[PDB]
Amino acid sequence: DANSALMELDKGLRSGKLGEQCEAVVRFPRLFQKYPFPILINSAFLKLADVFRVGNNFLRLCVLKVTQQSEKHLEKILNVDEFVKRIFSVIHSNDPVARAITLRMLGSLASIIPERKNAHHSIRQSLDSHDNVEVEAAVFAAANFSAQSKDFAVGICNKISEMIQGLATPVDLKLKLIPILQHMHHDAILASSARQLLQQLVTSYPSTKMVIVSLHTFTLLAASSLVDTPKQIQLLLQYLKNDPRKAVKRLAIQDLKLLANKTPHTWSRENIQALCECALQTPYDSLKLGMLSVLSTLSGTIAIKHYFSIVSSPRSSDLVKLAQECCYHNNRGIAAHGVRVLTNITVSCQEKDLLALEQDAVFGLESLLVLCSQDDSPGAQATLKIALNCMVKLAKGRPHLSQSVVETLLTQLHSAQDAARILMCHCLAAIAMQLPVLGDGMLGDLMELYKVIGRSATDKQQELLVSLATVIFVASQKALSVESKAVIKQQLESVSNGWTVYRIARQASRMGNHDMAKELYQSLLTQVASEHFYFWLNSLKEFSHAEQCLTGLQEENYSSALSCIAESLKFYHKGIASLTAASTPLNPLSFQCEFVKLRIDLLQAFSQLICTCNSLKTSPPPAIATTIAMTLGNDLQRCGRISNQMKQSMEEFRSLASRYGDLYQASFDADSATLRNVELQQQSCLLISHAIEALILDPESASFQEYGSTGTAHADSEYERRMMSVYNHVLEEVESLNRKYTPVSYMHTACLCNAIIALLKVPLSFQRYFFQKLQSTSIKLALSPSPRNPAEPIAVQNNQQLALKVEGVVQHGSKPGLFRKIQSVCLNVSSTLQSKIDNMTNEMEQRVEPHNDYFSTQFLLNFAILGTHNITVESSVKDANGIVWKTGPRTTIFVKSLEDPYSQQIRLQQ
């Protein structure tokens, strides 16, 4: 159909009327992106060129558009001289509009003909004529080549200098002309000549129009040619200080912003100083806002460390004075951009005298908060967002002031008029995610805010409701009191969407307060239409209830532990049944199901281990002594029946740890949170394994000291912090108890039991990737060997070879690179003998890099056996940092093997 579809447009192009001819001409990009085959692309462009050469001066415009639309497909043209001849043959036509169209088209073909001297000459010729509609196109084409060639730019720059300094050409065209000087970045000599031209052009045309154009063009030039940025910045600063034109000052600001955004480090100290002086001098609020925005952008980056680099007190530094004064200036925007610089400097640079500035900032923050509390204007909320972001950055960078800021934010919670409350609650939750004393003691007041929700607003009750739910759950560490039933009623009487209650339940489950989750999900269950959601909700309810039951554990009481674990497992099993039912061909809950299943496996391992250690006293010593003399025990050093079970459970725990490894290296999609959670569970499993192995089994063999950095407060969640604390407790116990007793496990059972109780104490936290999946990526991997419609095996003479042609395409549903971007695909092919090292002689791998979205790989498989063979291909994507990230369909193909009867008879006779 690919060839047919072309001639169907060809006959249209052959039609008499420009109606059909235009319809055909503008129909190609469709056919191109439908069939990107290079043969067809070339065939298409030949006919387009011909219809352009002989056209009605409107078919030419249509073809010009086609060229300007399908530019990516241009490089894949086999035949270029013929095409360019056809296009260029209409530059000698006397028609001033037919020359302008062709110059535009050439400009659109710089990618595939960047060195054509005749094209360069024709453009340089048309650039100095009398027809406006062609000069305004020659300018475009010249700017287009000046980027993809050098020997053209060298001539142009001189041409343009002359043709500006000649009094010819109106100012209107002189405006269009200057920007060409952007693309003088090819060589240092080009850049120097252009800059020398500027220094005269600006003074020779001190208009406002010309200045606005030229300064921006050549700040772009300085950005491109990174050798004179120090010179460019000082010119911009001089014009910022001196020229009175408000417009020129505003351009200076909007240009220094670009330079401070691209290359911050190069900014010297005196540059920042002069900028601050200029910001002080101006009486104009808008310009002051501009300079302060630039300074805020600089502060975040490395420039601040250079500015406060020594070889004058920081208080003597003028930057501090500007920051302080603008922190209290009337205007909300100026105040916000001031507090930004203060927060950045306080967090980054830590000098002895700056500590007072910490108090200054923290106190200015509440002023900003109260100012923006009730404004309810778009700019007001923008400033409020900036302020809360500064708050979060300050708190996380410096834990010292967290307690100070949190209590203030709580006090503003009362006075916020239900518009800024959502933002403030988000800020508070983010802050409390670090330290627990920031949430533990403020329980009542938050609920006082919560209770009045139903009456204080109606437009967007939902969002503030869910936010308050998240913050209250975060604050509530252990469990929920009557505050719980009060929340339940608040939802019931107040307008409460099913979606809303679902989100509160989700957040509850995410923060660990499983007690509320079961209750809420029960209310949900009698809802929804499709069975899939009912099953999913029921499964989640059972999981939450099992977690709640687990939470009721008592410290150091082995009797209750087994019963509680057994009950919680009696519930997880129903949960898994329901969840497995919930799956469908669509969104088959892979991660959700597998993670929870391995969780049940973990708890079963714990139950088995606790039972074994309890049975330690189950007449274990009787076996070893009766079997052999206790002294110099052959079965083990003070052998006992429990040794076999200890080996068994140790092996099981290591296997479970590696199964988490399989889950982790299979996800590849979750954010940086769920991954850390999974790693944490694997760490717990491996911890129990190491404890049992180094304490019960040969302790002298291990003889390893936990001599490594431990307990550094770098965790990203209270859950992680608590787990790290538990790990440290277990290690500090086991290291002490390594050699005290014999392997007979007198008190070692006590240590193991206490570790198990501790590990189960911290309830759980179902992480994001469990709920809601983002950044959907997949590999199609449709290998194209000799295709086999059914599973019927394919044949190969057995003496020669086989070639596979594994074809693969990567498909992104969401934002392609939200967290991890595929860098390479490590296709691994292996074969096995179907009928029977099991014939893995042919096991190879190739790391194909996908260039656009598509990767093919030729694989050769050698094999000389009669029986059938299985061919397995595994994808194993690999990301930027370099990781296995095992994924891929893991498709299989069966291949038959037969030999020529000629060789059969040869072997028979021989």
Partner 1 sequence: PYANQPTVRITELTDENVKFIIENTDLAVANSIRRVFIAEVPIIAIDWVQIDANSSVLHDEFIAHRLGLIPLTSDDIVDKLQYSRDCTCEEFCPECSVEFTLDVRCNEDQTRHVTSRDLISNSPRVIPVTSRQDDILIVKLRKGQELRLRAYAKKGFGKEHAKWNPTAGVAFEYDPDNALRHTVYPKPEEWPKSEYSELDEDESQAPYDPNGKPERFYYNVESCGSLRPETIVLSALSGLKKKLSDLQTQLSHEIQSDV
Partner 2 sequence: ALDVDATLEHVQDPQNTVKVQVLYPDGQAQMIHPKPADFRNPGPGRHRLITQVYLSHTAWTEACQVEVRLLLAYNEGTIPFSKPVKVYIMPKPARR
- Distance in Å, CB of 909 to partner 1, minimum: 11
> Interface with partner 2 by CB under 8 A: which range of 4-12, 461-469, 649-657, 838-846?
838-846
Whose structure tokens read 């010179």? 231
- Distance in Å, CB of 788 to partner 1, minimum: 12
Residue 732, contacted partner among partner 1, partner 2, none, CB below 5-8 A by kind? none
Residue 901, contacted partner among partner 2, partner 1, none, CB below 5-8 A by kind? partner 1
Our finding on whether 440 is near partner 1 (CB under 8 A) is no
Our finding on whether 866 is near partner 1 (CB under 8 A) is no
B/e letters for 493-527, b = 16+ CB within 10 Å, e = fewer, are eeebeeebbbbbbbbbbbbbbbbbbbbbbebbeee
Cα–chain center distance at 448: 38
Q: Mask of contacts with partner 2, 749-788, x by CB under 8 A?
A: -------------------------------------x--
Our finding on whether 900 is near partner 1 (CB under 8 A) is yes
Encoding tokens for residue 273?
Answer: 């100083």
Nearer to partner 2, 722 or 896 (CB): 896
Give the whole-angstrom CA distance, residue 164 versus residue 159.
Answer: 9
How many chain residues bind partner 1 (CB under 8 A)? 8
Residue 898, contacted partner among partner 2, partner 1, none, CB below 5-8 A by kind? partner 1
Nearer to partner 2, 852 or 858 (CB): 858
> Interface with partner 1 by CB under 8 A: which range of 542-550, 646-654, 710-718, 893-901?
893-901
Give 170's Cβ-side CA count (13 Å radius).
7
DSSP 794: B
Our finding on whether 728 is near partner 1 (CB under 8 A) is no
Give the whole-angstrom CA distance, residue 731 versus residue 705.
Answer: 10
Nearer to partner 2, 619 or 786 (CB): 786
Rounded (5°) CA angle 906-799-902: 30
Residue 859, contacted partner among partner 1, partner 2, none, CB below 5-8 A by kind? partner 2
Our finding on whether 557 is near partner 1 (CB under 8 A) is no
Amino acid at 781: L
- Distance in Å, CB of 831 to partner 2, minimum: 12
How many chain residues bind partner 2 (CB under 8 A)? 15
DSSP 793: P
Give the whole-angstrom CA distance, residue 521 versus residue 515.
Answer: 11
Residue 902, contacted partner among partner 1, partner 2, none, CB below 5-8 A by kind? partner 1
Residue 414, contacted partner among partner 2, partner 1, none, CB below 5-8 A by kind? none
3-state helix, strand, coil in the chain (%, to 5): 60, 5, 30
Is residue 803 helix, strand or coil?
strand
Our finding on whether 849 is near partner 2 (CB under 8 A) is no
Our finding on whether 285 is near partner 2 (CB under 8 A) is no
Residue 525, contacted partner among partner 2, partner 1, none, CB below 5-8 A by kind? none
The greatest distance separating any two alpha carbons of the chain, rounded to the nearest whole angstrom, comes to 116
Residue 900, contacted partner among partner 2, partner 1, none, CB below 5-8 A by kind? partner 1
Give 754's Cβ-side CA count (13 Å radius).
14
CA nearest to 558, candidates 627, 508, 617: 617
Our finding on whether 799 is near partner 2 (CB under 8 A) is yes
Q: Which residues contact 476 (CB under 8 A, 6 or more apart)?
A: 439, 443, 483, 513
- Distance in Å, CB of 869 to partner 1, minimum: 16
Q: Which of 902, 907, 909, 910 binds partner 1 (CB under 8 A)?
A: 902
Residue 803, contacted partner among partner 1, partner 2, none, CB below 5-8 A by kind? partner 2
Please give the torsion angle defined by the CA atoms of residues 616, 620, 621 and 624, in that order, rounded to the nearest 10 degrees.
-130
CA nearest to 717, candidates 517, 431, 423, 402: 431
Q: Which of 24, 320, 598, 802 binds partner 2 (CB under 8 A)?
A: 802
Q: Which of 844, 866, 880, 898 binds partner 2 (CB under 8 A)?
A: 844
> Interface with partner 1 by CB under 8 A: which range of 212-220, 272-280, 360-368, 899-907?
899-907
Q: SS in 3 state form for 863-906?
A: CCCCCCEEEEEECCEEECCCCCCCCCCCCEEEECCCCCHHHHHH
Our finding on whether 905 is near partner 1 (CB under 8 A) is yes
Residue 795, contacted partner among partner 1, partner 2, none, CB below 5-8 A by kind? partner 1
The DSSP-derived string for 542-611 is HHHHHHHHHH---TT-HHHHHHHHHHHHHHHHHHHHHHHHH--SSS--HHHHHHHHHHHHHHHHHHHHHH
Residue 789, contacted partner among partner 1, partner 2, none, CB below 5-8 A by kind? none
- Distance in Å, CB of 791 to partner 2, minimum: 21
- Distance in Å, CB of 664 to partner 1, minimum: 46
Give the H/E segment covering residue 362.
helix 355-373
Crossing angle (nearest 10°) for helices 718-736 and 674-695: 10
Specify burial of residue 88 (Cβ count, 10 A radius: 0-12, 13-18, 19+).
buried
**Binders in 775-804 for partner 1, by CB under 8 A:** 795, 797
Our finding on whether 226 is near partner 2 (CB under 8 A) is no
Residue 800, contacted partner among partner 2, partner 1, none, CB below 5-8 A by kind? partner 2
Give CA separation, 277 vs 86, 270, 291, in Å: 61, 10, 10
Q: Which residues pair with 892 in a beta bridge?
A: 872
- Distance in Å, CB of 901 to partner 1, minimum: 5
Specify burial of residue 257 (Cβ count, 10 A radius: 0-12, 13-18, 19+).
middle
> Interface with partner 2 by CB under 8 A: which range of 211-219, 348-356, 813-821, 842-850?
842-850
Our finding on whether 901 is near partner 1 (CB under 8 A) is yes
Nearer to partner 2, 78 or 310 (CB): 78
Residue 805, contacted partner among partner 2, partner 1, none, CB below 5-8 A by kind? partner 2
Q: Which of 164, 372, 598, 796 binds partner 2 (CB under 8 A)?
A: 796
Q: After which residues is the chain broken (C to N over 2.5 A)?
A: 311, 836
Contacts within 8 Å (CB) and 24+ apart, 161-169: 161/197, 163/127, 163/128, 164/201, 165/204
**Binders in 851-910 for partner 2, by CB under 8 A:** 858-860, 862
Our finding on whether 800 is near partner 2 (CB under 8 A) is yes
Query: Which residues form the interface with partner 1 (CB under 8 A)?
Result: 795, 797, 898-902, 905
Query: Which residues form the interface with partner 2 (CB under 8 A)?
Result: 786, 796, 799-803, 805, 844-846, 858-860, 862
